[PDB]
Design a protein around this ligand. Structure first.
Ligand SMILES: O=P(O)(O)OC[C@H]1O[C@H](O)[C@H](O)[C@@H]1O
Ligand SMILES: [Mn+2]
Ligand SMILES: [Mn+2]
Ligand SMILES: [Mn+2]
Ligand SMILES: [Mn+2]
Length: 391
């Protein structure tokens, strides 16, 4: 192997400006990092700058450097959708024609009618809502009637809440499996069906640790599958295992925040493995992008940047660090949906003694998967062109 270990970091939703097809998605004008930099009156990300972030694109407080630490470019998304699953599945070598759907006005009558028909249960709610707020609103009715609270949010999710002492947990799980099957349908394709059991009483409801998430498997066998099948390590950190429904994962590390995600990355740097360590930093998307909160987003990016020097200190000569994103989620943009943007790519190894240079623009996210696959001598993905030899 050229590299013994590859550390891949997805800064979730950290877009670097509207993609060529942004108009199709209602994303003209989008610019995640650039708009945040303007709001912050200059972002402070000196470590990303040292890697060559500004060499990709200059933004307020983010300037180019004469000798970037590693190689740099951006990537263009080829798949139809701008959701997390699409972005990640493409990154690991796939092409996804069918986009996952979001439901700002709730789910179509047709879908909920069939779910009622298959379960013998009534559905209430059917709207975007905070999980805790909707419990306050409808939890009592749910308890008295045995109906199901169905709701959604800014992401591609169908969530089903029911009181544990009214609807048995195993019945809630069965219902969610039925919903998961019904939503394998392009008309209502949801990324995730989530069981949301709760306990307590009106004015005092608590959601239990018995949450279960029902994901779809990637529409193809990924570079992660190939690594695992060839006996390499594939360490998933944060949402990564869930995003791929565990496909090709050899160890999974749960995280609670971006800072915790950087701690787990450091943990993997301390491990003797051969293969891939794959981190998703999800706070950017979950707390700041969808909430259209550029101040929180800017602070999170600065908190993340401050962690990088320890990562640089731990990387070995035969380690490669890859930093990218899976789409945009511009916190100064209409609505609450993701944005169709280019994503940054930074590629750094301490063995790059003269620093890096500009890579040709990546025409699909799958170029990352192809690079990983070629490095480890496993079956090349169908899509994507490796940049391994450029490094
Ligand atoms: O807490 P809730 O409002 O029920 O659900 C919000 C999100 O919490 C989970 O990460 C899922 O991604 C949901 O979209
Ligand atoms: Mn838009
Ligand atoms: Mn994402
Ligand atoms: Mn999202
Ligand atoms: Mn603040």
């Amino acid at each position: 192997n050229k590299y013994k270990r590859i550390f891949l970091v997805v800064m979730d939703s950290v877009g670097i400006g509207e993609a060529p097809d942004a108009e199709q998605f209602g994303d003209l004008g989008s610019d995640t990092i650039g708009h945040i930099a303007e709001h912050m009156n200059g972002l402070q990300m000196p470590n990303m700058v040292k890697l060559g972030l500004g060499n990709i694109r200059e933004m307020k407080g983010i300037s180019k450097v004469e000798k970037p630490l590693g190689y740099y470019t951006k990537m263009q998304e080829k798949s139809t959708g701008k959701d997390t699953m699409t972005g990640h599945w493409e990154i690991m070598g796939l092409y996804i024609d069918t986009p996952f759907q979001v439901f700002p006005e709730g789910f179509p009558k047709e879908l909920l009618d069939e779910l009622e028909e298959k379960t013998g249960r009534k559905i209430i709610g059917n709207k975007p809502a905070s999980g805790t707020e909707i419990l306050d609103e409808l939890g009592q009715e749910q308890m008295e009637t045995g109906s199901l609270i169905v709701y959604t949010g800014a992401d591609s999710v169908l969530q089903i809440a029911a009181h544990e002492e009214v609807v048995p947990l195993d019945e809630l799980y069965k219902i969610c499996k039925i919903a998961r099957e019904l939503t394998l349908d392009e008309k209502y394709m949801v990324g995730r069906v989530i069981a949301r059991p709760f306990v307590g009483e009106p004015g005092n409801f608590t959601r239990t640790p018995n949450r279960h998430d029902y994901a779809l498997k990637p529409f193809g066998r990924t570079v992660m599958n190939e690594l695992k099948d060839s006996d390499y390590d594939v360490i998933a950190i944060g949402k990564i295992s869930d995003i791929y429904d565990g496909e090709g994962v050899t160890e999974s590390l749960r995280t609670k925040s971006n800072m915790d995600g950087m701690d787990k990355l450091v943990d993997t740097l301390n491990m003797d493995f051969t293969g891939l360590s794959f981190l998703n930093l999800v706070d950017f998307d979950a707390l700041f992008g969808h909430r259209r909160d550029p101040q929180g987003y800017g602070e999170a990016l600065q908190e993340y940047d401050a962690r990088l020097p320890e990562v640089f200190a731990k990387l070995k000569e035969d380690d490669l660090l890859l930093i990218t994103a899976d789409h945009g989620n511009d916190p100064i943009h209409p609505g609450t949906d993701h944005t169709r943007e280019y994503v940054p790519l930074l590629a750094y190894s301490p063995s790059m003694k003269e620093g890096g240079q500009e890579l040709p623009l990546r025409q699909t996210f799958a170029d990352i998967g192809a690079t990983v696959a070629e490095n480890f001598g496993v079956k090349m993905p169908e899509y994507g062109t490796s940049f391994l030899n450029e490094l």
